[PDB]
Amino acid sequence: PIVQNIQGQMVHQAISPRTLNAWVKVVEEKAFSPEVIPMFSALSEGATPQDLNTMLNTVGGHQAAMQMLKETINEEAAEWDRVHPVHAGPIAPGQMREPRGSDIAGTTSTLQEQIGWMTNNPPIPVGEIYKRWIILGLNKIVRMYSPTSILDIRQGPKEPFRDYVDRFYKTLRAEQASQEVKNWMTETLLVQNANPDCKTILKALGPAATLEEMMTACQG
Amino acid sequence: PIVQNIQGQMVHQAISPRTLNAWVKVVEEKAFSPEVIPMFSALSEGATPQDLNTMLNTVGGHQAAMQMLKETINEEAAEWDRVHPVHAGPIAPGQMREPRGSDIAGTTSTLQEQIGWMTNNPPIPVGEIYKRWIILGLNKIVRMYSPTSILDIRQGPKEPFRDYVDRFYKTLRAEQASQEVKNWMTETLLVQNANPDCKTILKALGPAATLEEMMTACQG
Amino acid sequence: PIVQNIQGQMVHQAISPRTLNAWVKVVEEKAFSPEVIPMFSALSEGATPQDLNTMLNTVGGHQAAMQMLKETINEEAAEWDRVHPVHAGPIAPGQMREPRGSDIAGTTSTLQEQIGWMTNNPPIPVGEIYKRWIILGLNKIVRMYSPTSILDIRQGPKEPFRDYVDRFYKTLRAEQASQEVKNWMTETLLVQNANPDCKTILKALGPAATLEEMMTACQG
Amino acid sequence: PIVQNIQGQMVHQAISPRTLNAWVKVVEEKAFSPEVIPMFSALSEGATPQDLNTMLNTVGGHQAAMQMLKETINEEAAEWDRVHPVHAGPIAPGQMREPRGSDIAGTTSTLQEQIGWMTNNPPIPVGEIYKRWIILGLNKIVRMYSPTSILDIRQGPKEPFRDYVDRFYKTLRAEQASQEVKNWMTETLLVQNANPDCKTILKALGPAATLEEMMTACQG
Amino acid sequence: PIVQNIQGQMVHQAISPRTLNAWVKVVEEKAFSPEVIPMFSALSEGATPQDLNTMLNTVGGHQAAMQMLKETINEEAAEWDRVHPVHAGPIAPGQMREPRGSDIAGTTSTLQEQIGWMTNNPPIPVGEIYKRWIILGLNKIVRMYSPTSILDIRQGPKEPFRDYVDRFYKTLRAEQASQEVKNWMTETLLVQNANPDCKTILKALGPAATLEEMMTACQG
Amino acid sequence: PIVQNIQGQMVHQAISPRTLNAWVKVVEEKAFSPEVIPMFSALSEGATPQDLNTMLNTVGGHQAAMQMLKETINEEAAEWDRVHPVHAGPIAPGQMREPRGSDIAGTTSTLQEQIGWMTNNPPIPVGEIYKRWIILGLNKIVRMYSPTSILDIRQGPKEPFRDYVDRFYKTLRAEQASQEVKNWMTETLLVQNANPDCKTILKALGPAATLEEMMTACQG
C-alpha cells in the first residue's frame, strides 16, 4: 500500500505480514458475519489491486464465497468496460493509457503500472474502485450466509426479550434489503412477535414507544 | 485520527489496524464493563467522526446496545440542532460552515469536511462532541447491563467482607446517580447490609468511619 | 528484499526476521495448503535469489517436498541453459555478463552479482524468474499433497451442498489441469456429481447456472 | 505524556494504548505487589493529571482500593488547599492563576490548564505532585494488602534460610515504618527470628552481619 | 549491527532485544537442527563481531556445543594467523591496521575498531569471516547431534514410504558429506532400504527414476 | 534511554514498556542463570541511572539477591567517592558539577541532571559506570545461586557423559573464579571424574585429546 513521506509524496510499500495475518485470522475466527466489511475496509486502505488480490486469494476455505466474490467482480468489470470503452492508437507522453475492467481488477497488469495510475496527475483511484467492488461482493456474501429470513422470527415462551432482539437485529443487519424498509420493519415486526405478557406490556406504551423503554418494560 | 506532525502541521493519519484489533478484543473479553468507557476514550484520542463510526461498526454482537447508542446519538444531534440552528447560504472562501447534527455524527459529512472543521482556526470541536455523545450512550448501556439493583446488594452469612464490598462498589459504580446521592448511599446502605457478625464491628468503630478502618476491622 | 527509497536510489535490505518467522510459522501450521503459494508470493516481493534460498532453507521437515522443489529448480535451470547460450571471454566494463542457469538459481553466484543483474539497464528479472521456478515447484508439491482426485468427488446424502461445493472448489484449486479444461470441469461435474434432489433442482434451473443461483435454489 | 521533540517544543501526546494495556494487564495479573508502584511510576512519566486519571479509571475491580486512593487524594488536596492560599480576581495575561488542590488533582480543570502549568516559566509541575499523591495512596493500599505482619515472621524447621529471608524482605518492602526503624528491624529481627541452628551460626558470625555472609554461613 | 542510514552513511545500531529473544526462542524449541544455521545467518545480517558474541552468549544450556564452537573459532583464528601474517609497526593515519587472528573474534578488538574495519574503504570483511567460522562450528555441531548414521536408516514393515523418505532425507541433510558423494548415496540407499513390496514397486520404475515418480508409485 | 536523531544529537526518551515486560519475564522465568547478564546488558543499552533503578526495583521476588546487588552498588559508590573527591565552591558556567559516588547511582539526582551529564561536552558516562556496577552485582548474585561446587562433580554409573559435561560446564560458568584456572580445571577435573569404562576410553587418547573426540569416544 502507498504511504506518504515527510515531504508529502507517496511511493509503493510492501504489504505488511501483520495485515495479512490479521485478515486471515479474522476471516477464520469470525467467519462471514456483518463485521468483516468494516475491518476489510480498514485493513487495506490505499492498497493496490495486487494487494487486494492477495488478501482474497489468501483466504483458505469458504471457496464458494470466494467464487461468488470473483463472479461479482467479473460482472462489475464487464459493466465498467461496457460503460467506459478504451481508446486505441498512440498514447500521449504525459498521460498513461486508461485501464480496462480486467486491468482495473489488477489481473493482467504489473504493480508498477498500478503505482503509476495511483500516483498520476491527476491520480486515478483504481484501488478505491476495486475496493468498492470487493465490498459489494462481500455484502452479497454476507447476504448469502444469512441463516434465517426476517419474517420467520418468533420469540419462544422462555427465550428472553434480549436474545430475541439480538437475533432480530443480527439477521436484520445481515438482510440489508434497504434502509426505509428496515425502518418500517423495526417498527412493525419488532413488536408484532413478542411473548403475550411482555407483548401487552409493550402495547401499553403504544407505537410511540422507543427501544429503551421497550426493553426496560419487559426487564425485571 | 489526526495527529501533530513534524513540524506543527496536523495531517490525517488513518486509524491503525492494531487499535481496531485492541478495541474488538476488549469488547469481546470484557463485554460492557464500567471501565470500557475509559478504554474507549483513550483508544480514540482526537479521532475523526469516521474513526468513531468505524470503531462502533467493528463491534461484534450486542446489537441491541449499539442500537440504543445510535438512537441516543440521533437524539443528541436533534437537541444540538434545536439549540444551535444553522443558517443557509453561500459559505465564506476561507472559513468553513457551521456543522449540523448529521455533520457531527459523521453520517453525511465527508472526511475532508471533518478534517477542515478540526484543523481550521478556530477549531470546531466535532470530535469531542461526538465523543461526549458516544460516552453518554455507553453510560446508558453500562447502566442497563447491571444485573441487579444496588439496593439488593446483601452479604452472605459467611461471605467475607472483602468480596461483599468489592461487589457492592462495583454495582454502585455501574449504577447511575449524582455524587451526593452516592455519598449518602455509602453511609446509609453499606454498613446496614453487612453481615451481623462484622456489622457489630463496623458499628463499634463509628458512623463516620472511613473505608480502610472498617476493612482492616473485619479483616480476617 | 530490495526496498525502493523515497525519491532516491533503491537500497538493498536484509530479509526481516518478522518475515522469516511468519514464513516458517505458516509452513509449520498449515503444511502445504493451496494458499501457501499466494502467501509465499506475498511475503517474498522483490527478493533476491539469496533471500529466496534462505526462505526455502529455513523450512524444517517435508524434506521429500524440498528435494522435489530443488529437482524442479534444477530442471528449469537446465532448460534455461539449453535454450539460452552463454557468452564468455572479456566483458566490457559497466555491463554484467550473461547470467547462467546455475547463477539465476543462486547456487553459484553472490549477492553482488544478483543486485547487479537486478539494477542493470534494462533490468533482468532474476528474482522474478527464480520465484516463477519456485512457484512451479510449490504447485507440483501441492498437487502431490492432494488427498483425493477431482473426478472422484461425490456428495453425501446428508452432506449439504455448501460443504460439497467447498470440497469441490478446494480440489479444483489443487488440480493440475489447464484453465481451459478447468472451466468445463466446474461447468459439468459440479451439477453432474451432486445429490439427486438438488441435481434435479439445478436441472430444472437449466443452462447459465451460476454458483449464487445454484446455492439459493438448493437451500433447505 | 509530554514528549520532548528533538530540538523543538515539548509537544503533548496522548497516552498510547500500549501503556494502558500493560497497566491493566499488570494490575489484573499481579494484583497489588510492592513492585507495581515502581512499574506504575515507570509507565507514567511526565504525564498530565488527565493521563493519571485515565490510568486509574481503567483499573477494573478492587473498588475498595480505588475508593481509598480517591480518599487519600482528597485528603492531600484538602491539606494543599489549607496550607496554600488561593488568589482570585483579575489575572495578568501570560501568567496562569494559582493552582487549587481540587484543580491540582485534575478533577476541576481541562487539559489546557495542566499543559499551561507544566510549560510556565518557572515550571510548576502538577504531574510530579499528583503522582506523589497516587504513590502515597498505592503505598497505603499495598500496606493494607499485606497478609502477615513483619513482627510475626518465624522460620520453619525444614524451610531453608533463603525462603525465610525472601519472605522477610518481601514483608519489609510491604512495611510502613520509617527508614531508620526499617534498618533497625532488618538488622535485629532477621537473626533474632531464624531457626536455632543457623541462629547460633549467625551468632558465631558476630557483629557486622552482612546478607551474603549470612547466606554463605547457613549453607547446607 | 551496522545498517545503511539515510543518506548513504552507515552508523552503528545496537542489536535489538526482539532479535535476541527470537534467537533464544529458536535455540529453545528448534534447539540444534539443520534449519538453525540458515535462521542464524538471517537473524545476524551484517552483524559486528560483538553482536555475534552476544548472540552466542545468550544461549542457555548446551555448553558442550558452545565450547566446540569456541574451540573451532580459535582453530580458524590460528589458521588465519598462519596464512595472513600481521606486520608490526606504527599505523598510517588514513587507513586502519590489518586485523589479527583474534581481532576477528571480537576478543581484544573494541567496537570502534570493528566499525572502522567495516565502514572503511576498502572494507575489511571481518563480519563475514566470523560468520563463516561460526557457520563451520554450527555445521560441526549439527553433524554431531545426529542420533543415527545415514547407513542405519531402514524402513519398518508397515511404516509408510512418506515417513521413511522424510526421516532418510532429514538424516542425510544433517549428515556431512560432499554433494557428489550424496548423488551416489541416494541412488544406492533409498530404494534398497525400503519395504520389499515398495522395493519391487520402485525397481519396476527404473534405477534413475526421479523422487516424485518413486513417491507416486507407492502413494497410498 | 537516549537515542540518536537524524541530525545526530541525542535526547532523553521514555523507557519502553516492552523492555520492562521482557526484563521482568526473563528474570522470573529463567530466575538467576549466567545468561541473565548478557540479556540485561543488551536490554538497557544507553539507559539512564533512573532506568536502571527502575529495572532493579521492578524485580519482584528474590529480594535477597536484590539486596546483595544494592549492597554491592553501595560499596562501589563509596569506593568511587573515596577515589574521586568532589570539589566545593562555585562551579564554572561552561561546566556542570561532577557527580558524587551516590549520585552516580541516581538516588539523589533528577533525570535532567542525568541527561546533562550524559550529553555534556565531553560526555560523562554515568550510565555505563552504573551498568558496570550492576553487572558486577549480578555476577556475585549468580555466584551465590550456584547450586554445587566445582570439586563435588562425579558422574554416576548411568548418567550419560553428555549430562555430566553439561552439568560441569554449567557450574563452571557459574563459578567464574578466574579464566586460566578455568582452563586448568577443564583439563584436569573433566578427565578425572569419568565412568571407568569411558574413563579409560578417554585415557586412550591421552591429554592431547579435544572435547569433540572426547565425546564421540564415549558416544555410541
UniProtKB/TrEMBL annotation, chains A, B, C, D, E, F:
Keyword annotations from UniProtKB, A to Z: Capsid protein, Host cell membrane, Host cytoplasm, Host membrane, Host nucleus, Lipoprotein, Membrane, Myristate, Phosphoprotein, RNA-binding, Viral nucleoprotein, Virion
Entry's localization field: Host cell membrane; Host cytoplasm; Host nucleus; Virion
Membrane protein topology class: Lipid-anchor
Predominant subcellular localization, coarse grouping: host cell
Domain of life: Viruses
GO annotation, biological process: viral translational frameshifting
Keyword presence, Protein biosynthesis: no
Pfam family, one: Gag_p24_C
Signal peptide stretch: none
Family annotation (InterPro entries): Gag_p24_C, Primate_lentivir_Gag_pol-like, Retrov_capsid_C, Retrov_capsid_N
Recorded GO CC terms: host cell cytoplasm; host cell nucleus; host cell plasma membrane; viral nucleocapsid
Gene3D superfamilies (UniProt xref): 1.10.1200.30, Human Immunodeficiency Virus Type 1 Capsid Protein
Residue intervals of the Retroviral nucleocapsid Gag protein p24 C-terminal domain: 144-217
Molecular function terms from GO: RNA binding
Membrane among keywords: yes
PANTHER family, A to Z: ENDOGENOUS RETROVIRUS GROUP K MEMBER 24 GAG POLYPROTEIN-RELATED, IGE-BINDING PROTEIN
Name listed for the protein in its UniProt record: Gag protein
Organism of origin: Human immunodeficiency virus type 1 (HIV-1)
Gene, per the UniProt record: gag
